[PDB]
Design a binder for this molecule. Structure first.
Ligand SMILES: COC(=O)N[C@H](C(=O)NN(CC[C@@]1(Cc2ccccc2)C(=O)N([C@H]2c3ccccc3C[C@H]2O)C[C@H]1O)Cc1ccc(-c2ccncc2)cc1)C(C)(C)C
Lengths: 99, 99
């Protein structure tokens, strides 16, 4: 589909069998979601944003559906102000910017 | 043009007679640039992202050019770790997400 930007590009995603709302964010290298439980072991990662850095848990090869599109990749979990889908997953669903 | 998301979507913008590199950021409501001088009035604003909030100066009705596309809108100036082009200007150049 084609999504205009007059409003926030918020979409429904499915992870761990649950539906959540997330923002398609081209300004993000990675995907970071609010606190939640994910399987397996995680690795640490420090990610920097507009206001500084935060600590997050990194889970790899996690199945996640975005707007119905299937993806399997790295998901960071931590104290983010909102769920954001970064380029690591936007590329998996074939997303591009056009104008 | 069609911008790939395999890499960060960086573009050249022309503002205040200067040329700067900025990130096309669909997750950003506003446009924020590192410290620079801009003409006209302004008012303080606090914007929050990953890591917390930062204080910026809000300048309205600022002419800007992105990839040859002219537009006008609000530009925030402050200690942002990187230049970001937000939805308020992405809409004016007719930028959309497609997949
Ligand atoms: C390489 O780093 C990244 O890709 N970081 C991502 C990130 O923050 N991206 N933001 C952008 C992330 C988001 C997330 C958000 C969405 C809704 C509500 C609250 C927050 C954000 O915080 N945004 C803020 C923003 C930006 C411009 C103008 C106004 C505002 C207010 C707020 O919306 C836009 C979103 O895209 C742009 C950015 C890029 C590099 C560095 C850096 C930091 C340190 N050194 C150099 C550059 C700092 C910031 C993560 C989500 C993974 C943290």
């Amino acid at each position: 589909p084609q999504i205009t930007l007059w409003q926030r590009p918020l979409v429904t995603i499915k992870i761990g069998g649950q539906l959540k709302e997330a923002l398609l964010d081209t300004g993000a290298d990675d995907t970071v979601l609010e606190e939640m439980s994910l399987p397996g072991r995680w690795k640490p990662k420090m990610i920097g944003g507009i206001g500084g850095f935060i600590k997050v848990r990194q889970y790899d090869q996690i199945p996640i559906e975005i707007c119905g599109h299937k993806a399997i990749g790295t998901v960071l979990v931590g104290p983010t102000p909102t769920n954001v889908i970064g380029r690591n997953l936007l590329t998996q669903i074939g997303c591009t910017l056009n104008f």
